[PDB]
Amino acid sequence: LIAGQSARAIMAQLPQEEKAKIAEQVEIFHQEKSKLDAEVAKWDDSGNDIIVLAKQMCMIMMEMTDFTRGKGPLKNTSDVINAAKKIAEAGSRMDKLARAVADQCPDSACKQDLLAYLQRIALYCHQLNICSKVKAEVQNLGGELIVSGLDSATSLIQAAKNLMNAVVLTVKASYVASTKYQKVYGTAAVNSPVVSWKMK
């Protein structure tokens, strides 16, 4: 018929071999995403923006990886680039909250883990941006022109997985830091905790 010429449509018709390798890599990302599904389900995001943000970031990352399989709401490469900017704004906001939480944390070692994770978020947000220009491209394989999108895809996906892991680790670790605050100063502490960890 009259096939689409959009970037998304093109990714959808990559050579089978490459679609296979991309699925392998998407799976690995999916595994790291379920750990986030698991941890995020525990709680009720009212009064906890860290959780909301983590959900937003998860969602936008799903769109980005879907793009590489030729699916999802992102049509053009510029949409993927924009998606990556959204994630970075989100990640920056979270950074403001989690940093507040560590500034309540009185257990200097618990403060540690949250801070180190926070900089992984900055780092992989960044690398996600750098890797966001995903596009099939023309290549020359021994005098034969082919179309490949594998490397561009896998680069994005890896950055997405790495980011996901850092988000999970940041959600967990900021929870732990919140408890260490409550354990020490009790629910009747004058300064209420930065985020509320309700269980619903």
From Swiss-Prot:
Transmembrane segments: none annotated. The modification Phosphoserine is found at S192. It is found in: Cell membrane; Cytoplasm; Cytoplasm, Cytoskeleton; Cell junction, Adherens junction. Expressed almost exclusively in the nervous system. Disruption phenotype: Mice generally die within 24 hours after birth. They display altered Purkinje cells migration, unstable synaptic junctions, defective ventricular architecture, impaired axon migration, reduced number of neurons in specific nuclei, and disordered laminar formation. Interacts with CDH1 and CDH2. Interacts with ZNF639; recruits CTNNA2 to the nucleus. Interacts with F-actin. May function as a linker between cadherin adhesion receptors and the cytoskeleton to regulate cell-cell adhesion and differentiation in the nervous system. Required for proper regulation of cortical neuronal migration and neurite growth. It acts as a negative regulator of Arp2/3 complex activity and Arp2/3-mediated actin polymerization. It thereby suppresses excessive actin branching which would impair neurite growth and stability. Regulates morphological plasticity of synapses and cerebellar and hippocampal lamination during development. Functions in the control of startle modulation. Belongs to the vinculin/alpha-catenin family. The cdf (cerebellar deficient folia) mice are viable but are ataxic and have cerebellar hypoplasia associated with abnormal lobulation of the cerebellum. They also display defects in Purkinje cells positioning and in packing density and lamination. Fear conditioning and prepulse inhibition of the startle response are altered in cdf mice. Those phenotypes are associated with alteration of the Ctnna2 gene which results in the C-terminal truncation of the protein and are rescued by expression of a Ctnna2 transgene (isoform 2). This is Catenin alpha-2. It comes from Mus musculus (Mouse). The gene is Ctnna2. The chain holds residues 662 to 909 of 953 of the full protein.
